[PDB]
Amino acid sequence: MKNKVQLITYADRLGDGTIKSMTDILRTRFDGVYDGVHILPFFTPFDGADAGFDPIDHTKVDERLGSWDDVAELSKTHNIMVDAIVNHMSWESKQFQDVLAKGEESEYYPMFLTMSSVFPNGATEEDLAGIYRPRPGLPFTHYKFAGKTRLVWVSFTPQQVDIDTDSDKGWEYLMSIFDQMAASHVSYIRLDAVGYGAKEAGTSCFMTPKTFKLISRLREEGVKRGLEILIEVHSYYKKQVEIASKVDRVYDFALPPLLLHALSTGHVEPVAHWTDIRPNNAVTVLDTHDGIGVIDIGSDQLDRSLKGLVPDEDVDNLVNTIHANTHGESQAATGAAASNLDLYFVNSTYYSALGCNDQHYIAARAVQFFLPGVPQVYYVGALAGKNDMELLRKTNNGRDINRHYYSTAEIDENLKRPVVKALNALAKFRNELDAFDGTFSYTTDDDTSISFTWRGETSQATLTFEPKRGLGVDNTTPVAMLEWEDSAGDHRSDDLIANPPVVA
């Protein structure tokens, strides 16, 4: 996967509301900045319950957004990452409606998982109890096949029915999706809910062998079409390092909350630790289109005894430091869990989570870009955006606080801000200097300082990071220093907003 910075955006929430308008904004206002892009699901429909992840037809672009040819057009300039939902589909898909009508008789009946599919001899209490759940209850709901009442496997909502991926119709279906992906020249595929995709009795049905088997099968099928695979997994971090070894790429989900901590406190050990132990076949992010996941660095969900990269109190003080820095907006948006070790995500923008502090933000981005992996930026953070309370109050959907519909006017108006210009400058720097295609080294003091070093062929760079040097939401003291070597020799930057870095 190309080592240039990628952008993450909705088609309709950046520009006029379309794939072409998106491509326009991307080409005209971001050239050299984002050389690649991740387009969040654009299939039929895009405006549903879960904002694209519950398509009715995965194979077809929403005709309000565009077509496949808009995708193919965009492939010529930019590398493109797209979503493939491999675990489930709409109960309003023709395939499932057909099973509903004809029951066993045909033809899609085997495509779909039931309790009998996995558990032909019954299930124990322990059988069902041990299953990993992103959502509450049992992963089963009631539906009627022809006339007979059936329990159908459901991982997330009763509306998204789980496919048996080892079956022929199920595989035939996933391959209809890849074939269309390759036809429009997608580079990179995000495999969604793939952790949950393989069910075997007596297991947690989450990241078991049968699942790796499925992933490697999908990998080989992808490389055959020139598609690299990427898995999205929120879990206990040791499982993450476990998983990460046996696949091509993964998200780095630890770093954003880690940076929130360090900018909050000034303790950098945890980060020197993560730098030492993190998997480097990664995609790095700060913000995504879901909330800030705190479960990643916390204690394990099933067994509270396995402790993260900080104490449970420091996770509590993180959820509450966000709540405080945004003066209660995340409270409005994050539904209360009665405790903070029970939270998955804290819904807020990563600018707001910093109390709209520019020095802290830009430092965070710097560190993200210095660590090994391919960096991604989300449109809202590319625009350094604040929490949107109107939509949140419009839709009552927590995650909409971090998804703002940006018209072109708003983009060009937010483009004027110095922090936005510093971020742009910094991506361009990350893209143009060849030192990053090189080798990575790091140094730490104890707590006060960490230095990240890259050395390439014609060029060198080092970023030193000291959150102790200034503290607090309104503190304007630069916490990151930069030095580098290129055609023009040894250069330096002690403030990354006012004195942004350029290459020769």
Ligand SMILES: OC[C@H]1O[C@@H](O)[C@H](O)[C@@H](O)[C@@H]1O
């Ligand atoms: O499909 C259910 C969930 O799947 C995940 O892969 C997506 O990132 C979520 O945003 C979505 O709600």
